[PDB]
Scaffold this motif. Sequence first.
Motif, PDB file in Angstrom:
ATOM      1  N   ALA A 254       0.906  -1.272  -0.072  1.00 35.97           N
ATOM      2  CA  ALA A 254       0.047  -0.061  -0.006  1.00 35.97           C
ATOM      3  C   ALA A 254       0.888   1.188   0.059  1.00 35.97           C
ATOM      4  O   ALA A 254       0.537   2.170  -0.683  1.00 35.97           O
ATOM      5  CB  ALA A 254      -1.119  -0.112   1.384  1.00 35.97           C
ATOM      6  N   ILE A 255       1.902   1.136   0.749  1.00 32.70           N
ATOM      7  CA  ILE A 255       2.894   2.414   0.745  1.00 32.70           C
ATOM      8  C   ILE A 255       3.520   2.454  -0.764  1.00 32.70           C
ATOM      9  O   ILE A 255       3.847   3.631  -1.030  1.00 32.70           O
ATOM     10  CB  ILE A 255       3.801   2.321   1.889  1.00 32.70           C
ATOM     11  CG1 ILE A 255       3.265   2.502   3.217  1.00 32.70           C
ATOM     12  CG2 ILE A 255       5.073   3.344   1.790  1.00 32.70           C
ATOM     13  CD1 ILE A 255       2.321   3.624   3.422  1.00 32.70           C
ATOM     14  N   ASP A 256       3.715   1.146  -1.131  1.00 32.48           N
ATOM     15  CA  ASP A 256       4.235   1.152  -2.567  1.00 32.48           C
ATOM     16  C   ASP A 256       3.454   2.098  -3.415  1.00 32.48           C
ATOM     17  O   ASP A 256       3.712   2.797  -4.426  1.00 32.48           O
ATOM     18  CB  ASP A 256       4.468  -0.207  -3.101  1.00 32.48           C
ATOM     19  CG  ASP A 256       5.109  -0.158  -4.533  1.00 32.48           C
ATOM     20  OD1 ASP A 256       6.093   0.125  -4.734  1.00 32.48           O
ATOM     21  OD2 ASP A 256       4.450  -0.591  -5.498  1.00 32.48           O
ATOM     22  N   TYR A 257       2.001   1.801  -3.483  1.00 28.95           N
ATOM     23  CA  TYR A 257       1.087   2.360  -4.523  1.00 28.95           C
ATOM     24  C   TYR A 257       1.037   3.695  -3.956  1.00 28.95           C
ATOM     25  O   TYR A 257       1.100   4.633  -4.988  1.00 28.95           O
ATOM     26  CB  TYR A 257      -0.362   1.591  -4.071  1.00 28.95           C
ATOM     27  CG  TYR A 257      -0.671   0.105  -4.524  1.00 28.95           C
ATOM     28  CD1 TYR A 257       0.462  -0.246  -5.165  1.00 28.95           C
ATOM     29  CD2 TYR A 257      -1.607  -0.544  -4.243  1.00 28.95           C
ATOM     30  CE1 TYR A 257       0.302  -1.685  -5.680  1.00 28.95           C
ATOM     31  CE2 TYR A 257      -1.766  -1.959  -4.556  1.00 28.95           C
ATOM     32  CZ  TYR A 257      -0.796  -2.318  -5.386  1.00 28.95           C
ATOM     33  OH  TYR A 257      -1.307  -3.506  -5.798  1.00 28.95           O
ATOM     34  N   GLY A 258       0.901   4.258  -2.917  1.00 28.12           N
ATOM     35  CA  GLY A 258       0.984   5.513  -2.571  1.00 28.12           C
ATOM     36  C   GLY A 258       2.243   6.202  -2.995  1.00 28.12           C
ATOM     37  O   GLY A 258       2.413   7.389  -3.359  1.00 28.12           O
ATOM     38  N   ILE A 328      -9.258   1.267  -2.723  1.00 26.50           N
ATOM     39  CA  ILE A 328      -9.921   2.421  -2.599  1.00 26.50           C
ATOM     40  C   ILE A 328      -9.501   3.346  -2.040  1.00 26.50           C
ATOM     41  O   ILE A 328      -9.685   4.684  -2.274  1.00 26.50           O
ATOM     42  CB  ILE A 328     -11.246   1.703  -1.715  1.00 26.50           C
ATOM     43  CG1 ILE A 328     -11.874   0.637  -2.632  1.00 26.50           C
ATOM     44  CG2 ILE A 328     -12.123   2.594  -1.118  1.00 26.50           C
ATOM     45  CD1 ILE A 328     -12.554   1.091  -3.862  1.00 26.50           C
ATOM     46  N   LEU A 329      -8.586   3.031  -0.724  1.00 26.80           N
ATOM     47  CA  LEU A 329      -8.054   4.437  -0.378  1.00 26.80           C
ATOM     48  C   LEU A 329      -6.910   5.146  -1.214  1.00 26.80           C
ATOM     49  O   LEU A 329      -6.870   6.327  -1.093  1.00 26.80           O
ATOM     50  CB  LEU A 329      -7.358   4.121   0.960  1.00 26.80           C
ATOM     51  CG  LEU A 329      -8.324   4.064   2.304  1.00 26.80           C
ATOM     52  CD1 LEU A 329      -8.830   2.572   2.477  1.00 26.80           C
ATOM     53  CD2 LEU A 329      -7.202   4.090   3.580  1.00 26.80           C
ATOM     54  N   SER A 330      -6.492   4.473  -2.022  1.00 25.12           N
ATOM     55  CA  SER A 330      -5.492   5.001  -2.801  1.00 25.12           C
ATOM     56  C   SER A 330      -6.129   5.991  -3.931  1.00 25.12           C
ATOM     57  O   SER A 330      -5.718   7.093  -4.526  1.00 25.12           O
ATOM     58  CB  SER A 330      -4.674   3.969  -3.835  1.00 25.12           C
ATOM     59  OG  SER A 330      -5.387   3.432  -4.488  1.00 25.12           O
ATOM     60  N   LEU A 334      -6.773   9.741  -0.682  1.00 22.60           N
ATOM     61  CA  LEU A 334      -5.421  10.189  -0.717  1.00 22.60           C
ATOM     62  C   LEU A 334      -5.386  11.208  -2.144  1.00 22.60           C
ATOM     63  O   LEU A 334      -4.933  12.254  -1.987  1.00 22.60           O
ATOM     64  CB  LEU A 334      -4.358   8.887  -1.140  1.00 22.60           C
ATOM     65  CG  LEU A 334      -2.856   9.455  -1.241  1.00 22.60           C
ATOM     66  CD1 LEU A 334      -2.623  10.327  -0.048  1.00 22.60           C
ATOM     67  CD2 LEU A 334      -2.218   8.323  -1.503  1.00 22.60           C
ATOM     68  N   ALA A 335      -6.048  10.830  -3.257  1.00 22.55           N
ATOM     69  CA  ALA A 335      -6.320  11.684  -4.581  1.00 22.55           C
ATOM     70  C   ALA A 335      -6.984  12.798  -4.090  1.00 22.55           C
ATOM     71  O   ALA A 335      -6.393  13.942  -4.631  1.00 22.55           O
ATOM     72  CB  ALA A 335      -6.891  10.783  -5.504  1.00 22.55           C
ATOM     73  N   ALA A 336      -7.763  12.935  -3.422  1.00 21.09           N
ATOM     74  CA  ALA A 336      -8.587  14.050  -3.052  1.00 21.09           C
ATOM     75  C   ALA A 336      -7.622  15.050  -2.466  1.00 21.09           C
ATOM     76  O   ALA A 336      -7.696  16.150  -2.511  1.00 21.09           O
ATOM     77  CB  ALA A 336      -9.866  13.762  -2.439  1.00 21.09           C
TER      78      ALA A 336
END
Length: 725
Positions: A254-258, A328-330, A334-336
Amino acid sequence: MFAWWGRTVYQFRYIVIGVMVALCLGGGVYGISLGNHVTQSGFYDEGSQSVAASLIGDEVYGRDRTSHVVAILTPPDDKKVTDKAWQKKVTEELDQVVKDHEDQIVGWVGWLKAPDTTDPTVSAMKTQDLRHTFISIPLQGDDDDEILKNYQVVEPELQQVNGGDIRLAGLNPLASELTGTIGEDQKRAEVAAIPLVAVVLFFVFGTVIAAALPAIIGGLAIAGALGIMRLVAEFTPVHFFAQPVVTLIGLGIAIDYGLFIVSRFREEIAEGYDTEAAVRRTVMTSGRTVVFSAVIIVASSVPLLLFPQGFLKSITYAIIASVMLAAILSITVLAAALAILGPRVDALGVTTREEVERGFWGRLVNVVMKRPIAFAAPILVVMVLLIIPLGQLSLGGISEKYLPPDNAVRQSQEQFDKLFPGFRTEPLTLVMKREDGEPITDAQIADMRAKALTVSGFTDPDNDPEKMWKERPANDSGSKDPSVRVIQNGLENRNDAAKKIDELRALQPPHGIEVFVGGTPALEQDSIHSLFDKLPLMALILIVTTTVLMFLAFGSVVLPIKAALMSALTLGSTMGILTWMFVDGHGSGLMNYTPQPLMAPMIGLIIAVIWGLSTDYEVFLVSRMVEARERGMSTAEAIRIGTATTGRLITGAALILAVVAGAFVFSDLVMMKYLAFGLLIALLLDATIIRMFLVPAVMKLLGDDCWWAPRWMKRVQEKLGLGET
């Protein structure tokens, strides 16, 4: 669609903030407190005849609770156990604990309760020098959880006997030692990891917020995962040590994705695009990659649902909900958040060579493509040796060897197992059931025993067949039924188990009566057989599913089968290196662990995870190679642009994977050291050798073949609405 949510997030900005902030605190209190309510006895017994025979056995004769805790008492000042004053003293002490825990202990049994006894085995309990004797303290409880909670209720008073000088070993002392290693590993991780991940984040960035964001995502992630599982628990529960591993893995990728989100956002900001346009193309650009990665992981996890187990099923369920919640959180919160502040998130700062390396990478790729055989030869020769070691593999079960060699309980156990040989046994059970329900005649018993005696190679410690195949003892809590009777006996060598197991299943019982062959060796050898029976079908589904999915991502039919073959090669090479370092022992003395066979379904899990991970990074990479190729330009231009717009990304994703790998080298637990180290080593080897060697060489070999595609398949691709590269 995305435009709609784009405008809706500005119109609903206040409530998504009020809800999500309320949710994390709410999910924290409901999660840290509650939702993990599953037992630990029952993750391995699933189907087969041995399990039915175990439920029937426990139902008739009752569960045996004598084999839970064995305490070794040693008199101080080198006094022998025959000292009578001391015995009376400890007996009163024992009676004192019986006075304090009538609700947890039924009673104690042993030679102390009958010094002048005619029972042979009990006279065989005392050591030949009359210096040591151990007692068993059965506890109340219907499952291992109540038992463990009773052990925790009694451990103080039990540890206070003999003036505090008493070593506690056995099943419950060990279960307690295991979950305490759990707590030690969690706290160790939070005091060794959050500072390390803090300095690693601060050394890659220049602004506070960019490094503080992955931590914010991490805290919200565990809170929302505990909330997801609290919702999951109304239908299906989740348990075990398998939960922190799920949180570290998910929080990591998930940190990789962000990381790819913050990098792509900084890139679009640096090229000069406004926030809205940048966010819309990054959304679709990232979201399409996450969707592909997720559907790939789903195809990697569903085949396990083709063949159920339990512990594994719960983990695959946790992985699906963890990756989906991460995506979903990504693509939402986060995007918003990044969309409102934008680049002024990098304004204040700490008030109180990447291009030279990228050029070295370009000159090196040009040297590789310039002299490819100098690379192809060593790689493919390295390939033969990978599977050499793979053939060596052996499969086994759990035992006291599963703990580190410096654990007190294991040495106490080994001492018990050498001082009092013969008491510890793993016997095969012969559960006998008649369908008439009428009682079994004495002759039917002597007949069954005579046929069980017609097979040699079975232990006979008394040296007399008349005493062999005794009836199991009947406890006072079993519904005694003359319709069922069980006899048992251990093996002289657990290796002839497999041979003798086939001999036991092949016996023809009397006409109207049926015999069930059970015991822990049979459950283990039947799960082993079922797994090596369903391994081909598993590989088949894995290959065909990944090939069709790659046939959908790409437009070719040969490229997916090629990637499939090279992913199979990487798999075989990973399990061959693991067998080469964990079965023959090269590297056991340094990392401090004992080599032993692995639990096969865990190798199935590691194959699925490695396959899906290598495939996801292959889709990310070739997905950008194809997007640039679809943008025109020559092959050399598409190559350079690809390995230029992503060299820094794959390097940071590697630094991240190495930080997390150092956190799993700190994850403790020997069977976790073998698995976590396997994943870390294979992941680094594949992500620094396979992708960068194989890809440029294969694309070069194909040439203009890289673009071919049947016409009807291209129209199918177009008729589904996909192709926004």
